[PDB]
Design an enzyme around this catalytic site. Sequence first.
Site, PDB file in Angstrom:
ATOM      1  N   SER A 105      37.356  36.414  47.111  1.00 10.19           N
ATOM      2  CA  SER A 105      37.295  37.826  46.838  1.00 10.19           C
ATOM      3  C   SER A 105      36.965  38.550  48.183  1.00 10.19           C
ATOM      4  CB  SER A 105      36.246  38.054  45.722  1.00 10.19           C
ATOM      5  OG  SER A 105      36.372  39.335  45.145  1.00 10.19           O
ATOM      6  N   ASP A 187      44.181  39.012  37.217  1.00 16.11           N
ATOM      7  CA  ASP A 187      42.891  39.216  37.815  1.00 16.11           C
ATOM      8  C   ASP A 187      42.265  40.490  37.237  1.00 16.11           C
ATOM      9  OD1 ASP A 187      40.781  39.804  39.632  1.00 16.11           O
ATOM     10  OD2 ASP A 187      41.709  38.351  41.065  1.00 16.11           O
ATOM     11  N   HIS A 224      40.023  36.157  37.922  1.00 16.85           N
ATOM     12  CA  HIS A 224      39.460  36.301  39.247  1.00 16.85           C
ATOM     13  C   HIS A 224      38.712  35.038  39.702  1.00 16.85           C
ATOM     14  CE1 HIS A 224      38.307  38.494  42.778  1.00 16.85           C
ATOM     15  NE2 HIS A 224      37.018  38.350  42.523  1.00 16.85           N
TER      16      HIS A 224
END
Length: 317
Positions: A105, A187, A224
């Site tokens: 991320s 995501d 995610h």
Amino acid sequence: LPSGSDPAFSQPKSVLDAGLTCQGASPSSVSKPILLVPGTGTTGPQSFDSNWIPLSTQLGYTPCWISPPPFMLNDTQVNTEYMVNAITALYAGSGNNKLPVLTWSQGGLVAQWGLTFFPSIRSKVDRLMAFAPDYKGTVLAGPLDALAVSAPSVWQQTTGSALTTALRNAGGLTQIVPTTNLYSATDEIVQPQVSNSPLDSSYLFNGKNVQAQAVCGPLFVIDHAGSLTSQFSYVVGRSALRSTTGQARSADYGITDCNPLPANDLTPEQKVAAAALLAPAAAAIVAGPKQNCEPDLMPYARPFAVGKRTCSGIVTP
Ligand SMILES: *[C@@H]1O[C@H](CO)[C@@H](O[C@@H]2O[C@H](CO)[C@@H](O)[C@H](O)[C@H]2NC(C)=O)[C@H](O)[C@H]1NC(C)=O
């Protein structure tokens, strides 16, 4: 790309060094390090203990990581200082050998900000293996910002932010070292990710951009966290870490690796922790600092985002 000198750090190197560690070694003497850069709302161990710490160890590396405090919620530019300092230390500590960087991320946005604005590191990083990187930020942060409940780095990771503007205007949306981006359309944190194209937040020009659905089909789902933790993600990551090109190779993975469950090699407990990864990170977000404006750009980045608005007002040259 910026050329020229690395900008000075705003933090002392003693503070930066304290944010960096290696599993079972000092950064000043370490064999085959890999630097892991964690996601928003986490420390190194929190992002990676369920996945790439034991996975990367099992691939023959010494895992090192940074834990910029608190939980990657503070200024992304400061988080990047930890990363740059780390690369300098680990390059030296491994005998002046280049090292891979692997990220989740925010960690990928951090690595790419580093490579973009601190040139000394471009020759010290071997390759970048980014999972669900948010180089364009995310549209999901906008409403939080509007309510002034966003952490400093959440503002910065907002689509349209002063920080994402600066990155792209300095050339940061083109890979700078051999880079692999593994991401998913499905995501729930980082969007947009659905185009399998330069529109996606995880895409870099000339990178190995692997949207999981482009390989696994439109009904493949990893979220995610699964972007980091899945068996398909592991296969791609392994490929990237082993590849003599510095990027993953389509020859190394196919349809039969399209397993969305946590990586097979992980222990039952790591698999449970991997599947739960988003919960503690959302909780850390909620408990951390919050403000009503995006942190100022540091002087080195201001020419690249003229006209955007931060805490001190509108960015000038
Ligand atoms: C998160 O960032 C804030 C703002 O940069 C930090 O708050 C400052 O910390 C410095 C150095 O410790 C102080 O001298 C300033 O007076 C503080 N300014 C503020 C609150 O506006 C804070 O320390 C950072 N948090 C962590 C955990 O490092």
